[PDB]
Design a protein around this ligand. Structure first.
Ligand SMILES: Nc1ncnc2c1ncn2[C@H]1C[C@H](O)[C@@H](COP(=O)(O)OP(=O)(O)OP(=O)(O)O)O1
Ligand SMILES: [Ca+2]
Length: 266
DNA sequence: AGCGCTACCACACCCC
DNA sequence: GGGTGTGGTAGCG
């Protein structure tokens, strides 16, 4: 109830074919529309013209969004809005300052990370998976090894992203102590000891840069790594790039009549 | 007309 | 000197 109260105060304080394309200034007004929609619609965040994080919000289906998005001539700097309390996938934001840590073997650190989380998923939930179920994206530059991992688990999902964070803090506590998970620590922008895993992305209504999208500032967009081992099922009725787009979406959990929802309280 | 939060610091408090 | 909650903005994500 504590969350539903903060929104109520912010509110008072503030022919053609079957298409759906609604832009909203307030994230709250967007989700309100989704409820009164009657169509499998979702919420996207577009970075406004301002160089800061000022964002506007779009509401449309995945298919209709990919239609006006695939060319990459329009709708640049888009983000997925991960709805609070909604079932989602296991994902990661991986990033360290390249020059600050030279000896870091990026492609080797991710494999060690995945094999750990995989083992963790088995010991704690009986879930079995391998890197073959891990969509691997890249947005790196000459100064930042940036990677996004989206797990594609078979009939499995988390209660929400808040529980994903709890899962990681639990299994990454041995590394957090280091103010064998030695390969996680990395020197930050100013010599400080941060964690190769960004644990600040597991919040309510988190934005997450979409596939083939770059921040309003730079121009490097997310793309599938070369060592990626997740390959969707080829379907003649939709393009392959659309498959990766659907997979990459954190909050687009495969409909399954045997879905195991995973929880984890802190 | 973004949104969410925590890391950080100040203070106040308590205890033999 | 240690140890434990409480505000409250400032800045990351
Ligand atoms: N000002 C911001 N406002 C709202 N959401 C943000 C903001 N900054 C970051 N986020 C969200 C969207 C981002 O996809 C998510 C992770 O932070 P961030 O690392 O900066 O983006 P990114 O991982 O997609 O690119 P990269 O890390 O390589 O710079 O947090
Ligand atoms: Ca990042």
């Amino acid at each position: 109830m504590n969350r539903k109260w903060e929104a109520k105060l912010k509110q008072i304080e503030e022919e053609e074919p079957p298409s759906i394309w609604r832009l909203f200034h307030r994230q709250a007004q967007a989700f309100n529309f989704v409820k009164s929609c009657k169509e499998d619609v979702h919420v996207f965040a577009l970075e406004c013209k301002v160089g800061d994080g000022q964002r506007i919000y779009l509401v449309t289906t995945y298919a209709e969004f990919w239609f006006y998005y695939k060319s990459r001539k329009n709708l640049l700097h888009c983000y997925e809005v991960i709805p609070e309390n909604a079932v989602c996938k296991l994902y990661f934001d991986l990033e360290f300052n390249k020059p600050a840590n030279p000896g870091a073997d990026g492609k080797k650190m991710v494999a060690l990370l995945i094999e750990y989380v995989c083992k963790a998923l088995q010991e704690l939930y009986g879930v079995n998976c391998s890197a073959e179920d891990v969509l691997n994206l890249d947005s790196s530059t000459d100064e930042k090894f940036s990677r996004h991992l989206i797990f594609q688990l078979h009939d499995v999902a988390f209660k929400d992203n808040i529980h994903v964070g709890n899962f990681l803090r639990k299994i990454l506590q041995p590394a957090l102590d280091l103010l064998d998970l030695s390969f996680l620590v990395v020197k930050n922008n100013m010599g400080e000891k941060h964690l190769f895993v960004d644990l600040g992305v597991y919040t309510r209504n988190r934005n997450f840069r979409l596939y083939k999208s770059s921040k309003i500032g730079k121009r490097v967009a997310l793309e599938v790594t070369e060592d990626n081992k997740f390959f969707p099922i080829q379907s003649k009725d939709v393009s392959d790039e659309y498959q990766y787009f659907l997979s990459s979406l954190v909050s687009n959990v495969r409909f399954s009549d045997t879905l195991r929802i995973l929880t984890c309280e802190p």
